[PDB]
């Protein structure tokens with residue numbers, strides 16, 4: 001059933017699973033028209049599909065051309081997401097197809113289920129977790145490839161860089177979600193934190209700075225402080 | 238007019254005939270039901286005074302033979318039987334009609350209720366849903382499950398209703414996944430109407446049969462089937478105008494006939510609010526909507 005804090009370790013077992021997040025699939029800027037009305041202008045988006053065990057991210061890029069002439073786009077976006085997830089599954093060799101897919105928003109359950117009818121042995125699950133994958137467009141290189149895209153495009157990332165050489169997937173995942181939670185609550189601060197020390201660079205093939213173990217500990221604590229603070233600054237506590 | 242005679246009434250039971258019912262005391266001199274209108278199916282149904290568990294009953298049509306009820310004390314129930322010897326049956330019944338030991342099917346003449354609830358129900362189709370082909374009549378009760386309920390256990394005692402499943406490959410064409418799921422017109426018209434049911438009358442007959450088994454026996458899967466067949470129609474943008482008109486009539490009488498005290502188990506809040514207010518056909522069921530809002534405004 002639903003994924004929550006109690007079955008949290010199941011992410012890191014040896015059953016293939018992907019998270020899907022659709023929050024960045026349909027993106028608009030809202031503006032005033034010359035007549036003084038409001039119109040939306042869509043910008044490129046992405047589906048954030050992610051194997052929490054390996055860190056492989058299947059960033060499907062959603063070019064605004066896909067919304068051309070379409071109605072009820074917030075709804076189409078969930079079916080378009082499900083179409084793309086399903087095409088991704090079909091393209092993987094059998095032994096790489098997930099046994100589960102966990103959607104971060106319950107509205108995606110029925111669209112994915114319908115598209116996945118050909119894969120009855122794949123469980124489509126919701127979660128009770130309030131995960132921060134929406135903040136994934138606060139990762140600069142991810143934001144970059146999405147905004148530059150000129151056609152639909154799939155780009156493959158490892159969202160853990162090389163962390164797994166040194167830490168467990170459980171711990172990788174916790175770091176990642178601490179980074180994304182920080183990015184979501186206060187992006188400016190979160191980013192200041194990650195790059196304050198210009199000597200700690202991001203390898204061209206990575207998304208995050210190459211911190212040492214001790215430098216990650218310092219970082220993680222600063223992101224924690226950030227999240228507790230922005231919660232106080234928000235609720236006055 | 239025809240007759241369903243009884244050997245006796247050895248246990249205390251409430252007997253239903255169609256939408257009518259009366260109390261019979263243990264070993265009361267009761268010998269059957271007379272003046273049953275020809276031309277319709279009928280259901281004669283039973284709730285023992287001791288064990289309100291298990292309503293049961295028989296769908297039948299008097300044109301398809303002479304049919305009596307004889308209580309069976311081994312199996313403990315009122316059993317429908319067929320008498321092949323017509324002479325014997327005409328004589329025995331005239332005997333009981335002379336001694337006036339039969340209740341009269343109490344049809345008021347202005348009243349088209351039964352016809353309206355059974356318009357498209359035909360015995361021949363009931364017998365395919367309720368497979369027991371040695372008998373011209375069909376046994377149903379409260380606990381019988383449906384062919385779809387068994388997928389999710391005894392197949393001989395099942396209700397073989399048409400399997401409808403909105404998240405199935407049958408319902409969803411590859412390539413129109415969103416289109417066919419939000420607008421089931423493909424499923425309704427091509428798969429079901431043209432493919433499985435053949436016409437709207439067989440479809441409506443199953444839908445009506447399913448309500449009645451829901452209402453008279455509280456058969457849960459029959460209500461599931463009834464709500465599903467409504468929803469398929471209501472969730473389809475393209476429905477022949479004549480089917481929309483007939484469905485408004487069909488449901489109107491089902492809601493009219495439903496016991497006011499049973500609405501909470503037999504009426505699915507979700508399907509009805511969706512049908513009357515969200516679906517393509519939200520504007521196409523005026524009589525159904527008017528009666529639902531004046532009788533059961535609570536559900537909505």
Ligand SMILES: Cc1cccc(N2CCCNCC2)n1
Nearest residue numbers: 242243244305320325326329
């Ligand atoms: C009440 C009714 C009417 C007609 C026939 C019939 N029966 C029962 C008598 C014993 N078995 C023969 C058939 N029973």
